[PDB]
């Protein structure tokens, strides 16, 4: 819970080792048919047999040490499931920003079995201590941990909808005549439907005395709308291989690290590709900021990268190629707020709202706290 990431990791490993089966299973794939072979063979196994040693066979190749052939199969299949012909996923923003399940996935008639498969595969990666690069979002990880997505999470997947809900939260809708009811619409595959946000929501108007419950239910609906069955199929497939309850103690950032591996952060590249707003590279707080970063070990730097961008993954080009929800967006630090505030981030824009703190000590303390405790 409050224990270190490394401690939680070893507890999880002990659960995995304590429940391993002997012998092995063979997965034989060809590279041209990676997904189809991987899908047929894995879905034709009893799920507990996937806890045995994995013998991955690239049909017609080398062999030797399995750590590297394991990593290549896990890596490549984690990209192949994104293949648009399968119709399983889509992206919230431009240029493959913010992966999410495609609500129209049922156009693939097998799509629930495909999601169950991806669940098994992701559990296999965790179980066998191997890493993937699919790009699931921090709220997708929250669901696996039975953490409710927050209002702040919305800003990562849907900046406008977030701003829209923030506006309602902060403003008197009765004063502006805003007409809202506890219902929402959704069109998928050209078939628009209506979901009541609670019983009788159709007629229940949103008032100042209603607002907080409305915001909550609307938030829940944005994250689950149209992807319920897909998400359940993913979760049941994962759970079949590795019980989801073994993932206790992790927060969603740690789970992302568990699945992605650990990125070494180049402080040089980071600093050469940061842009400022109101601040400049010579501002006192910006200098204090980079001194805090230099003082951080690599785990804290990753934690900060996740806090500001919403992910531990850097693009292959480094910090220069960093993408936001509306195109390329470099890491940005902006002078916003009071020194009584904590730093805040807008992950869709890779932006850190750094208040003009008066001392290195104050900035360092609030920054380390925010990274550890807030999102």
């Amino acid at each position: 819970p409050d224990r270190s990431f490394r401690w939680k990791y070893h507890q999880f490993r002990f659960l995995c080792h304590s429940n391993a089966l002997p012998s092995h299973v063979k997965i034989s794939v060809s590279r041209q048919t990676l997904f189809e072979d991987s899908f047929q063979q894995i879905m034709n196994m009893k799920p507990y047999d996937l806890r045995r040693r994995l013998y991955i066979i690239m049909r017609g190749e080398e062999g030797l040490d399995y750590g590297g052939i394991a990593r290549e199969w896990f890596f490549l299949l984690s990209h192949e499931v994104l293949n648009p012909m399968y119709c399983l996923f889509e992206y919230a923003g431009k240029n493959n920003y913010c992966l999410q399940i495609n609500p129209a996935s049922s156009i693939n008639p097998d799509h629930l079995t495909y999601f169950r498969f991806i669940g098994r595969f992701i559990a296999m990666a965790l179980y066998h201590g191997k890493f993937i690069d699919t790009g699931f979002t921090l709220p997708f990880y929250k669901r696996m941990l039975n953490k409710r997505p927050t209002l702040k999470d919305l800003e990562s997947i849907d900046p406008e909808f977030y701003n829209s809900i923030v506006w309602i939260k902060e403003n008197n809708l009765e004063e502006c005549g805003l007409e809202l009811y506890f219902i929402q619409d959704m069109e998928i595959l050209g078939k628009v439907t209506t979901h009541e946000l609670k019983e009788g929501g159709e007629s229940i108007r949103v008032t100042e005395e209603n607002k907080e419950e409305y915001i909550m239910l609307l938030t829940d609906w944005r994250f689950t709308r149209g992807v319920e069955e897909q998400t359940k199929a993913f979760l049941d497939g994962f759970n079949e291989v590795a019980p989801l309850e073994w993932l206790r103690y992790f927060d969603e950032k740690e789970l992302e690290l568990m699945l992605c591996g650990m990125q070494e952060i180049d402080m040089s590249d980071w600093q050469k590709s940061t842009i400022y707003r109101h601040y400049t590279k010579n501002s006192k707080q910006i200098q204090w900021f980079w001194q805090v970063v230099k003082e951080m070990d690599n785990e804290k730097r990753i934690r900060l990268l996740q806090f500001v961008t919403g992910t531990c993954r850097l693009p292959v080009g480094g910090f220069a190629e960093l993408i936001g929800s509306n195109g390329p967006q470099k890491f940005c630090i902006d002078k916003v707020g009071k020194e009584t505030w904590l730093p805040r981030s807008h992950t869709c824009f890779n932006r850190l709202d750094l208040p003009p703190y008066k001392s290195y000590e104050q900035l360092r303390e609030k920054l380390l706290y925010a990274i550890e405790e807030t999102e």
């Binding site: 992605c260 591996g261 650990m262």
Partner: peptide
């Protein structure tokens, strides 16, 4: 890419064990 995955994997194992 594969190079980055080798790094991510090895750095993770070293951090943990």
């Amino acid at each position: 890419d594969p190079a980055q995955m080798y790094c991510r994997e090895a750095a993770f194992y070293c951090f943990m064990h």
